[model samples]
Target: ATFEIVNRCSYTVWAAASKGDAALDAGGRQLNSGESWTINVEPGTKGGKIWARTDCYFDDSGSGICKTGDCGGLLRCKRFGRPPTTLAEFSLNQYGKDYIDISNIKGFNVPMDFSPTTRGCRGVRCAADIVGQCPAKLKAPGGGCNDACTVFQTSEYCCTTGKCGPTEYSRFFKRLCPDAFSYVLDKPTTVTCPGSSNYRVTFCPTA
Candidate 1:
């Protein structure tokens, strides 16, 4: 029997497989956009998984925009036990460029995870001279950590008075969309981590 994989994204896909974490001797090939690949497999080949990984690149300075094109190290896999008699079709969607749905097989519900590697911010100044400068003190209207601080000493006093920092804003965004791209695992269930709210599954099996 043979299985078919379809790539509907804007770029190509790199496919790989493994049997119980042991890398299988599989060839690396590119599936261009709107392309499909058919592979013949032995019947009942159990304990093995197949994965399709796409490309992603991060550009922090480019208007805080991130682009995905070159394939990443992440792989999407499906276990093989009983091969479907008919062709199995897997459809993918564009979820904020770098993210996509890999498990779109019809009727067979399988648990899968699409994990993308973290690309740290670049071209941004990590440390600034205005470390503790906030203008919230001296009854200054609208001059906290969220605003700009000109005077160093005054900013420090303002920070001490308001007690606000970037950590608070980061936490606030996480609270709103806990399952954003930065979240570790993009699964179909909620994941609870310390100091962070649980993340619920955003995608599910199509009806």
Candidate 2:
């Protein structure tokens, strides 16, 4: 599957994607405002993740840290990004279907829309101004908003043990992006599309 990643935010963003130990585009690509990039996912790729890094300063060798989604300070990530990130997660070509979802389980940074370009599958987006609406207790330093689990790592929020219910914090995120996975045990927001479908992942997407 192919993913067209577009940056519509007012600032720059370093986009990154990962499949376990494998990194897409060497782990990161700089996309200035209004710019776009593309990534080709191999068939049968599972537990894939795509996200954005903001307020970064990298040298020529791709060594640097981002305020959000920093991956060991390397522009080319070798692991999953840090929390307070909006993620486009997927599993491609699994049993002839592609499973896709938008998640704020870690937290929220930029608005996002993950949609199929060919198939008529329903799209999911978390395009609200979460930063502006974030409560101070859950706000991250520099930018973005942290999830309840990130700020308060208790069983009530993290669901580290038994079944967990949504808290006021989770409800805050759910109210904003009803189509996104707000918590670990949040209701189903995953959607399935054709195996051969191409997708568009737009940051700061407009209606």
Candidate 3:
């Protein structure tokens, strides 16, 4: 399995993926406009997630920060990236297929599409103009939309209980990111692509 990440945005798109541990730069490539990067996945790879980092800078020491999605400020991340960015979730080669989705639970920073490169595979995406009309309270200071969990830690919003349902805040993101996860346990947000398929993610997918 592999992730073919494409950046269609005019600016740089720092793509990151995690395989349960530290984050790996997708093919160690920082995609400029129209550029793409691919990352090979091990057969046993599980719980993998890909996300985009915006407005990031690294010095010679790889010690810099990303305004939206910084993972400990390292050139390579030692942990999962922070919130306020769009996420592409995956459990590759599980249940005899590729399980995937675009998640807005942590809010969205960019429009993105995730799809298989082969036939007979389902594609999922969240390519909406969320940043432009994000609610004032849920807007990230630098850019992007912020999740209610970040703004309001209340149980009602965060759903500390397993029985909780979506709230007005969650619906705000759901309206735009119809196929993306707007809350924990968000159903029908994921699709199963054949396990043998290679996947691609596109940033600024509206173009």
Candidate 4:
């Protein structure tokens, strides 16, 4: 599938992609507002996710840190990024289906729209003011909303035992963005589409 990633944040965003600990082949790109980049995802790719970093300053060697979602301080990411960042996750060709979702489970930075370019599939959007309304304890220092799991690390929030449900914090996130994955065990957010469909991931998406 082809991913056309668009930046509409009114600022710069360094986008990153990964599957597990390794970066995607076209790992990262610096995108100014109104700019777009196209990337291809091979079939059968599982646990693929993409995110954007904000307030970054990378020198010529692609070495620097971002205020949010910094992955190893490199322009070209080699690992999954840090928390408090919105995520677009994909599991393509899984038992003949493509699974996708917009996630706030790691928390949120910029608003996002994750949608299929093909017909008959609904999109998932998370464009709420999560940062401005973030609870004090779940706020990241670099202007993002941190998940309760990351802040407290308890089984209630983290679902480490695979036997937990939503907390007030997760419910708060869900109430704000009903289509997003609000917690580790939150259900009904995943969307299944045809594996051949293309997708668009827009950062700071507008109505």
**For each predicted model, how many residue pairs clash, with residues at least 3 apart or on different chains?**
7, 0, 0, 0
lDDT score for residue 44 of model 2: 87
lDDT of each: 0.27, 0.89, 0.80, 0.90
Residue pairs with backbone overlap in model 2: none
Q: Model 3, 1-207: lDDT tens per residue?
A: 777889998888778777647554432346788998888766546777777889988888777888877788865665667778798888877868778888888888888999988877678888889999899999899888899988888876676876668888889889987899898866768887777678899999877
lDDT of 1 by residue, 162-193 (tens): 55343332233233333321111223222112
Which stretches of candidate 1 lie above 4 Å from their native place? 21-27, 56-207
Scanning candidate 4 in windows of ten residues, the lowest lDDT window is 17-26
TM-score per candidate, in order? 0.28, 0.96, 0.93, 0.96
**TM-score for candidate 4:** 0.96
Compared with the true structure, the alpha-carbon lDDT of candidate 1 equals 0.27
> 1 or 2: which has the higher lDDT?
2
Residue-level lDDT for 128 in candidate 2: 93
Q: List the residue pairs that clash in candidate 4.
A: none
Cα shift from native, residue 82, model 2 (Å):
0.8
- Per-residue lDDT for 116-192 in model 2, tens only? 99865888999998999998999998799999988888998888885799989999999999999988899889999
- How would you order the candidates by lDDT, starting with the best? 4, 2, 3, 1
